[PDB]
């Protein structure tokens, strides 16, 4: 009855939006094991953009999140069908993944806007009137 | 065999230092229930200092932390012996609490410096040379 779920990401400056996404993946089925993949520093900076925390730091933080059962750190930057077979993964949860949908292994999850870490720094700054 | 542990705090902009502290409280004994108290907005600002996230936001974030079994939100600003009796609390874990030590109900925990949220914003800013 136990369904292996895989989610990946940078998880830089972990905030409530990441946590809500992890929870939703974990609760896709009644009985799950959620594996979370954490992207490497060199590959993230080359392909996506700047990251402030190292792989070690980003991974140590995810360890404290209730919904996380396993962590692959670093994870591969591209999910392959060999990867799914090797870790006996039943679904990938993300927010091209055409082949994942074709195989029935795709489960969508939602981003929550406005809860980010950068948003909080903006809130602190609003305390200082421009004039 | 199950030991009720109580920890309280502001938990504004939750970071790895808070998480490590919660873990340490949770692992004080083999078999624990960790209750976490979250201080109110009005009382924190009057007595400690400024807080950026509301009570609701600070509490919703703690809900995702693996070590947290129960949350009292808002918690009282001062722990009283009536409070310990009402929630059948065996130890309070903090980092005056003289009466707690006299009763054998005090367990110390450690702050981890340098992992804070404000520290990360400083790191982002170091990317911009003064000149
Ligand atoms: N969430 C950031 C985008 C991304 C996700 C997963 C991955 O393997 C590579 C990039
Ligand atoms: N960690 C901030 C200091 C504080 C802790 C607990 C409490 O009930 C009131 C203030």
């Amino acid at each position: 009855k136990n369904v292996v779920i895989y989610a990946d990401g940078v998880y830089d400056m972990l905030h409530l939006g990441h946590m809500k996404q992890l929870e939703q993946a974990k609760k896709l089925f009644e009985n799950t094991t959620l594996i979370v993949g954490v992207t490497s520093d060199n590959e993230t900076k080359l392909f996506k953009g700047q990251v402030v925390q190292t792989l070690e730091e980003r991974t140590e933080t995810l360890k404290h999140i209730r919904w996380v059962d396993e962590i692959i750190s670093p994870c591969p930057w591209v999910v392959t069908p060999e990867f799914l077979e090797k870790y006996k993964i039943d679904y990938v949860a993300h927010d091209i993944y055409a082949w994942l949908k074709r195989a029935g292994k795709f489960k969508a999850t939602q981003r929550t806007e406005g809860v980010s870490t950068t948003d909080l720094i903006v809130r602190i700054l609003k305390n200082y009137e421009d004039y």
Side-chain angles (χ1 to χ4, degrees), chain A residues 23-29 31-41:
Chain A
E23 184 190 14
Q24 182 176 1
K26 169 82 180 153
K27 298 181 176 177
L28 284 170
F29 299 95
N31 254 25
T32 68
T33 291
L34 173 64
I35 309 175
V36 174
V38 184
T39 55
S40 76
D41 286 327

Side-chain angles (χ1 to χ4, degrees), chain A residues 19-29 31-41 43-47 49-72:
Chain A
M19 299 172 194
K20 276 158 98 61
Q21 255 196 309
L22 295 169
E23 184 190 14
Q24 182 176 1
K26 169 82 180 153
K27 298 181 176 177
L28 284 170
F29 299 95
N31 254 25
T32 68
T33 291
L34 173 64
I35 309 175
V36 174
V38 184
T39 55
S40 76
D41 286 327
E43 281 168 315
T44 302
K45 298 155 180 200
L46 189 60
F47 298 131
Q50 333 195 17
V51 177
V52 2
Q53 302 185 282
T54 65
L55 178 65
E56 197 170 308
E57 300 171 322
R58 293 181 283 125
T59 300
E60 194 176 353
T61 301
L62 268 167
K63 171 184 79 155
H64 297 275
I65 298 305
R66 176 186 323 272
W67 323 113
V68 180
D69 299 319
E70 299 190 8
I71 301 188
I72 297 158

Side-chain angles (χ1 to χ4, degrees), chain A residues 6-11 37 39 44 47 75-79 95:
Chain A
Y6 180 76
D8 62 20
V10 184
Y11 306 100
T39 55
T44 302
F47 298 131
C75 66
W77 189 259
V78 192
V79 176
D95 40 304

